[PDB]
Structure 1
Amino acid sequence: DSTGKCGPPPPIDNGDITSFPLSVYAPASSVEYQCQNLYQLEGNKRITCRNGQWSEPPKCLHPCVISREIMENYNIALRWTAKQKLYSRTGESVEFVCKRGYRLSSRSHTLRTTCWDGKLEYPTCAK
């Protein structure tokens, strides 16, 4: 669309470019993005430099960190594993149990939750 050269590619949170950054990019030149370990790239991984501007860069969809602190606070615990920390990726499901002695105060379906961009809906238990 122009002979417009682009500057270095736009930065993205919890990710970076698969190449080494130049200061000047020729038109139709394109870079590729890679998100950090359990971050899901949402959008195009490849951005072209057309009309002296970069294409819309992607987002790195946040994973969910399930710490034992959180689980102890909601009086819950992981049903299927002994693990005290779990790094669920966006889209990965997680099933808890009410820690021995406590009963479920939240809705019944809330014992199984799915990770969505760093937000996992933890259930509540009380006694």
Structure 2
Amino acid sequence: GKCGPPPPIDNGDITSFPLSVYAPASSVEYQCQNLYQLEGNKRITCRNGQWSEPPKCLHPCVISREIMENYNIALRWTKLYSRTGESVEFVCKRGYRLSSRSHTLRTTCWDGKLEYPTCAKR
């Protein structure tokens, strides 16, 4: 009932060195790179000559000063990258107000997607 090598994952690796072959009931653990959020079980186990589902590494988000300027917003406080699940709080630049269709000023990074709010001239 042996397994072969554990699968690769993007932006991460296992915490041990990989082997050609693994005994049944063996397990290995994954770790994501810095600021990438591990989704799923970190541990996978060898059952019936098959590994359990490996995890994913959810992307963080880049915060763009260019987009902020384009959308007439700024950071409320003062961090160029945001974890999945972590939030960023913006404010309208002075003389501008939230657009009618605009996302909220407080916005959350999910797996590489960040929705910026947009403010328009008063």
Answer whether TM exceeds 0.5 for this pair.
yes
1:49 is paired with a residue whose SS is strand
Paired with 1:15 and 1:29, the residues of 2 have a C-alpha distance of 20
Extract structure 1 runs of 4+ deviating beyond 6 A. Answer: none
TM-score, normalisation: structure 1: 0.85
Q: CA RMSD in A?
A: 1.7
Aligned length: 121
Q: List aligned pairs for 1:27-106, cutoff 5 A.
A: 27-81=24-78, 86-106=80-100
Q: Deviations over 1:71-112 (max 9, x none)?
A: 12222111101xxx5211111111111233433214577111
Paired with 2:85 and 2:92, the residues of 1 have a C-alpha distance of 23
- Of 118, 123, 126 in structure 1, the residue corresponding to residue 117 of structure 2 is 123
TM-score, normalisation: structure 2: 0.88
Offset of 1:6 from its aligned partner? 1.2
8 Å CA contact retained: 1:77, 1:97: yes
* Structure 2: runs of 5+ lacking an equivalent: none
Evaluate the alpha carbon distance shift between residue 108 and residue 125 of structure 1 in structure 2; reply closer, same or farther with a 3 A threshold. Answer: closer
User: % of aligned pairs identical?
Assistant: 100
Bigger CA drift: 108-117 or 28-37?
A: 108-117
Offset of 1:61 from its aligned partner? 1.6
